[PDB]
Symmetry: C2
Subunit: 302 residues, 2 copies
């Protein structure tokens, strides 16, 4: 399976820390509020269009849509079906996964599976989040997308491996995010995080993903060109890269400019990696979801 | 091939009949007779205690029960499960997912755990995704779950006594519940082979048939939380269901006369009859539950699987069909004993 393109859609202008401090290691972010001006669906439509244009694929050529989010516009209809309609994609399966930040890698894993097994040949994969209903310096809003096709396509990036794995048994959640019904009491934390557990466990789990990807591929550590690490903040990113022991690999990060946009991150990384990945160059991507300790990763070869 | 080893369900609390529900809501006998005429759903299960309106069951509680039941029924331990996939419209929280929470409760760990968000066709989506992952990789055994709990969207303590019955007809249609199934790669003697399964969005340019909102912690909740187009559902669901039957029968080479069971969409007692009429499968025995359980969304397919698996003998054939009106998704699957 090849990755033909990846693109992103970020709402509005960059909002630096000065500006955010006034209105009230991550320097800027994009927000979907100026009033809410961009919905998940609007951004997924933009990202999907950009990805399809970059790949030279028309909407009619799409055989499958898979979208990962923690924050869909509504519970139903899904964002996946709504964005497929906006794009002119129809008569195809359209799946939506619910998760935190590894939902992007889950979407890539599901899609890889369905392309290799199936009648589908070309897929549009999306991931993103808009957390405007929950709002401060860590987060951002954003969606990204990628076009995948069966085969090795010259000039593209081969998706050499992908996996996800829950390693949460008996562990308390590391993050929570609630939704409310139309009449119930809402005076409780809508979102929670265990920073102590995240700081200790994310870098260890990121290292285990790297060791697994490398060992299954038979790839050597010093032969890796790029690493696309977890993107929680500038500080956490620096801490994880030191733990990964990939001194030869160039880091592909965005959180310091974009904020943590959850399921969008992997796609923004893919876009930035594909803008650098030459023929034969190798890349690892790692996504660790703290909600219930999901480790995930993938491997690309130019 | 992938085989369905077992299926099981978990329905919260007591069976709640229409007269009990009427007493609660302050309705009269004429109202009960209208429900019988137009709806035909006789009983349902609710995740709330009817008298107090207090929530007694969560989606995760129910999924734990249903999953435990399905694993026992298949003779599979939690440590032997290699994949979990859950379909719902109503997860307990946005994160963590119900899939991961229920995996914890069951003792399942070290596996991919996927959660699909959809209306009623999420169950068949979960079957499709699971089939592909079992066939494509090292995983051999999967637990697949689907269900819904809509207690956040109803209030049995509200004053409905003056309203036209059409205005609160949802109260007689829905039910809360979860089901589960255990799937294994390959042909398994005494199991049911999942011979085909598919899902397909056909809603391009069409208005949603149903909508369901969720709210943030501070936002104004004035907008309608749920909408439905009951006329559009009546117009399209029977025809879309017939189209799914036609496609399944053609792709397998099965004749209508040799079909043993049909598991049709479960929207209400009277709608089921209309749909079965449109399917034109006079030799097939219907496997329905909606008149007893209410429409529990993603749970429906698994409740039907539980019932059909108790009846499906070697060589016997069944088709399931799920049509999701949210954005017009058709889906179905074929079983052979």
């Amino acid at each position: 399976v090849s990755v033909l393109s990846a693109a992103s859609a970020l709402p509005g202008p960059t909002v630096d820390n000065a500006t955010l401090g006034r209105r009230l290691g991550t320097r800027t972010r994009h927000l979907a509020v100026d009033e809410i001006r961009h919905t998940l669906a609007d951004l997924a439509h933009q990202a999907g269009s950009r990805a399809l244009d970059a790949a030279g694929v028309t909407p009619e050529e799409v055989d499958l849509v898979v979208l990962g989010t923690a924050t869909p516009d509504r519970l139903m209809p899904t964002t996946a079906t709504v964005v497929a309609d906006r794009l002119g994609i129809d008569g195809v399966p359209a799946y939506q996964l619910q998760s935190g930040c590894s939902g992007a890698v889950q979407a890539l894993a599901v899609t890889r599976s369905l392309l290799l097994g199936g009648t589908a040949r070309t897929a549009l994969v999306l991931g993103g989040d808009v957390v405007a209903r929950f709002y401060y310096v860590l987060f951002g809003d954003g969606v990204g997308a990628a076009v995948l096709r069966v085969g090795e396509v010259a000039g593209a990036a081969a998706l050499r491996s992908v996996f996800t794995r829950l390693v949460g048994l008996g562990r308390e959640p590391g993050a929570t995010l609630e939704w409310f019904g139309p009449t119930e009491d809402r005076n409780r934390p809508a979102a929670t995080e265990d920073y102590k557990a995240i700081e200790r466990h994310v870098p260890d789990l990121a290292a285990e993903v790297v060791e697994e990807l490398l060992g299954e591929l038979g790839w050597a550590r010093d032969d890796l060109d790029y690493v696309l690490p977890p993107q929680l903040s500038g500080r956490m990113t620096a801490l994880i890269v030191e733990r990964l022991k990939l001194p030869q690999a160039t880091e592909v990060s965005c959180v310091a400019e974009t904020g943590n946009n959850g399921n969008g991150i992997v796609f923004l990384q893919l876009e930035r990696a594909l803008a650098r990945l030459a023929g034969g160059q190798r890349a690892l991507g790692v996504s660790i979801e703290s909600s219930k300790w999901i480790k995930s990763g993938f491997a690309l070869e130019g």
